[PDB]
Design an enzyme around this catalytic site. Structure first.
Site, PDB file in Angstrom:
ATOM      1  CE  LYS A 199      44.137  29.109  53.431  1.00 31.60           C
ATOM      2  NZ  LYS A 199      43.324  29.960  52.521  1.00 31.60           N
TER       3      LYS A 199
ATOM      4  CG  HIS B 154      39.812  34.162  43.843  1.00 36.85           C
ATOM      5  ND1 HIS B 154      39.574  32.799  43.949  1.00 36.85           N
ATOM      6  CD2 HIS B 154      40.038  34.672  45.077  1.00 36.85           C
ATOM      7  CE1 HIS B 154      39.665  32.512  45.236  1.00 36.85           C
ATOM      8  NE2 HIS B 154      39.938  33.618  45.962  1.00 36.85           N
TER       9      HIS B 154
ATOM     10  NE  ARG C 293      35.222  35.961  51.349  1.00 38.25           N
ATOM     11  CZ  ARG C 293      36.166  35.094  50.991  1.00 38.25           C
ATOM     12  NH1 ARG C 293      36.185  34.593  49.765  1.00 38.25           N
ATOM     13  NH2 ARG C 293      37.081  34.703  51.866  1.00 38.25           N
TER      14      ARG C 293
ATOM     15  CB  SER D 136      38.752  28.444  47.435  1.00 36.48           C
ATOM     16  OG  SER D 136      39.221  29.330  46.441  1.00 36.48           O
TER      17      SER D 136
END
Ligand code: F6D
Ligand code: F6D
Ligand code: F6D
Ligand code: F6D
Ligand code: F6D
Ligand code: F6D
Lengths: 157, 157, 159, 159, 159, 157
Positions: free
Chosen positions: F40, F16, F89, F127
């Site tokens: 989440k 990030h 990604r 993450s």
């Protein structure tokens, strides 16, 4: 020729309408089969999803909307359907659908899995995306039948 | 040469047996390592999964079945294994496995990640698909060792 | 005791290939880096050049032998008494092709195991084709090649 | 009543194609196995050979007709009074190409429906191109082909 | 102040390319639509034709300049004092190629940023190659092209 | 020119940081927007994630860190941002990002979605992977800003 189009339809979107409409032009009778699908913890009850899909498909004379909790290959046999329809959008769906089709073939080799691609208009949406946009006060009138948009707004209110 | 094959194995399927069998033909000793894996909320306890994999692999003389909750790269070092085996089926697995292998390389650069592809027979199944088919009264005898199919039927009964 | 082949076109051999063959040497007693004599696509470097470059680039690895082959890679493994065929995996396109290749090799030689290794992140976005095209367009590719290969590619492009 | 076309190069027709056309015969009253006369890529087998091989290989299926075509597959479906165009789906690369093909066919002929079938796991990792290349390298491909196709491929490679 | 290049073959420029370059004009003060002079694959339209078509098709956009180039796209950006290189992303195959291209451009020119834009859903399933092949097979492609490109493609195919 | 870079950032990683740093070199002002993201079930509270991203980006003079629970397209409009940045990604991210970008375009057609690719160094992390490695006592100092690694160790202790 009878086809079944099974899914969670929580709620039914214009992408699902597009698929079931294309199915009605190919088969004499289409069964739109709504799975209770408790593992997905649906936003709408099974009874609500069936009523919504019934109102949204009433203009298609050869569509029958039903609910089920059975193994989808058994449910297809019970509807006397020799074709099981699934929509294909993206690579993730494609991989999942390949596993589903091969398993369904193992369980019922005479049942043919057939795939349809939705309009480009609906190729980037899902029930899950629509619900989350609506949960954040985003307008989703373009993606849903009128009666479904009303029920989604009512449920979130 | 010692290899470890780590996974949740909830439950072990014919796809996993295929991989561990191919591993036994390449390495002198294979450790089939079952992760407690609480984030996946497994259907079977760790003790049940170890007993099931032990009975299912007893015909392979150079397989040792063990349970673990450690970082898999540390557990490989503790088993004196220089090779970590993972099966590869689909694109989704491949992307996940690339992240896992690069992280394992960062943590233990001397530990080599090796990938094997299962038979076409098992290339469209997973423990999760098998459990869901069985939960819906679908027959899964073809996908599991006999003792595993018995335990899955017993757990769902 | 355990013998493996690592087949490919290696046109030319890159640091991605060196990475894969080095990892294979740590797992197997003997590794045969197998160079395709006549691929369907005409190579930039002849077989003699590709073999000479791969030999010089792997000379520090004591258990590697570089060999040219024109037959089925599964037949070549068997003739080399190799029970393992190594292939590197970088991306999704590689994965789909490798799945077809592995299932076919299994039909042809079921006793031959296909194993897959992943290269360093450093070489995960390159190929011999990308490197050649960058060098043809006068770009700096020194970082992606063994010294001898960098020398040979510069000499080939100069004429 | 319901008519479908199954278009392709079929160079040569494999057991993967036979699998797809057999499943289509169970769904439609009439199936036209449509063979591309002039693909951009030069075929190994001429149109006459590909049509003769596909006819012999589908002769046991009573509601299949093998026809050669050189036009837009969407135009060919319309001229055959077929409202369904069948395509087989094996892998991710096939899926991306089929998505482009289906959306284009829909722009050209919106009343024509593209349907997709998945072959047996047995044929999910092969293609005519892979099979030809394996046979060219002297590999055993008997399992992937109808008997007549296996005979024709052996005869073509012998000369 | 902020300058961007949008490089490609544009053989011919489609409504997908127009979509991308229009969005780039809203983000950057100056956009250079950069046309590859000599791709490895021989283009249908010559460089002069591709430049003339792209100029007429972007003439309504005041901050676009169409320029031909034969060098490394990263070198071309630097010579144009452009710190941003734009590429459109449609599908998974595009994504894998663009990842290789972006990491290579970063190795060559680390100060150059690669940015990716997504076209309208309308153009997400087309390419210049698909459009040319459909037109060669006498299919209606008017919807996918600027008017001048549709005129030029019809004239090229007529002879 | 103003850009927003929205995400869960639970916690913010070097991947990030790489993206937001590249954004600062292209735009006059970058808003790093941290979503409350309760679906989440984040490990860190929104206030903790904002403080962490503020300390991690303090060396970039044109970055502003803020929290939000709004529809991201509305939040971009409210920050006067005409560009919405997302990192790309892998294939899974790409498919998800295509759906997100098309929906955001439907909701705010004047807002441009722009994608950046991180360094190869961070192309195989997330993450979620970092948190799981750390949960299993694996060292993740290489993947996180110093202050974030400290907070992650403190939260797990
Ligand atoms: C590739 O599929 C995977 C992969 C990994 C994990 C799980 C799955 C599947 N979702 C597992 N479920 C399967 C597999 C098969 C072959 N037959 C099935 N029949 C049903 N019936 C239930 C009925 C209810 N309530 C259901 C639930 C949701 C949607 C539908 Cl359309 C049907 N589920 N089901
Ligand atoms: C690409 O991987 C991702 C991506 C996103 C999120 C999470 C993950 C991984 N599942 C995170 N877990 C990782 C990463 C690494 C590098 N080393 C790890 N060691 C373990 N050990 C546990 C032990 C227990 N109980 C475990 C759990 C399930 C299966 C296995 Cl084989 C091992 N987990 N673990
Ligand atoms: C998934 O593979 C595909 C898919 C579609 C089309 C073609 C292919 C393959 N390239 C076809 N070739 C195959 C397949 C198999 C199973 N075994 C093979 N053995 C060889 N040997 C030659 C020897 C020479 N000269 C060769 C050529 C290029 C590279 C290598 Cl490593 C080896 N080729 N070959
Ligand atoms: C997604 O497809 C792509 C993507 C990029 C480039 C080219 C293509 C296509 N191969 C271009 N060709 C298309 C597209 C469409 C929409 N309709 C088409 N009709 C035909 N008819 C010819 C007839 C002959 N001879 C043909 C050629 C090969 C195979 C077949 Cl099945 C049919 N080709 N054709
Ligand atoms: C991921 O890319 C791959 C992967 C495998 C093989 C080849 C490639 C590339 N097409 C190789 N070419 C590259 C790579 C790089 C990094 N920089 C490049 N600069 C150029 N400049 C030429 C100029 C001309 N004429 C060109 C050619 C075609 C299209 C364009 Cl936009 C530009 N080519 N080029
Ligand atoms: C392709 O996206 C899918 C696909 C399937 C299911 C769900 C999604 C998305 N996660 C659904 N959420 C969407 C869609 C759109 C278009 N606009 C959105 N605005 C927000 N705002 C919330 C604010 C909070 N708390 C949020 C949550 C997590 C991360 C961010 Cl950056 C923002 N969420 N959100």
């Amino acid at each position: 020729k009878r086809a079944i189009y099974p899914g969670t339809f929580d709620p039914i979107t214009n992408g699902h309408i597009d698929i079931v409409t294309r199915a009605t032009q190919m088969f004499d009778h289409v069964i739109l089969a709504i799975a209770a699908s408790p593992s997905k913890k649906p936003m709408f009850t099974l009874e609500e999803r069936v009523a919504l899909a019934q109102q949204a498909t009433a203009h298609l004379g050869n569509v029958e909307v039903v609910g089920f909790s059975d193994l989808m290959a058994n449910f297809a046999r019970n509807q006397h359907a020799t074709v099981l329809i699934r929509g294909l959008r993206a690579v993730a769906d494609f991989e999942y659908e390949m596993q589903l089709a091969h398993m369904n073939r193992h369980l019922m080799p005479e049942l043919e899995s057939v795939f349809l691609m939705p309009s480009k208009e609906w190729s980037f949406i899902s029930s899950s995306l629509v619900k989350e946009v609506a949960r954040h006060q985003g307008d989703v009138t373009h993606f849903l039948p009128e009666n479904v948009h009303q029920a989604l707004m009512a449920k979130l209110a």
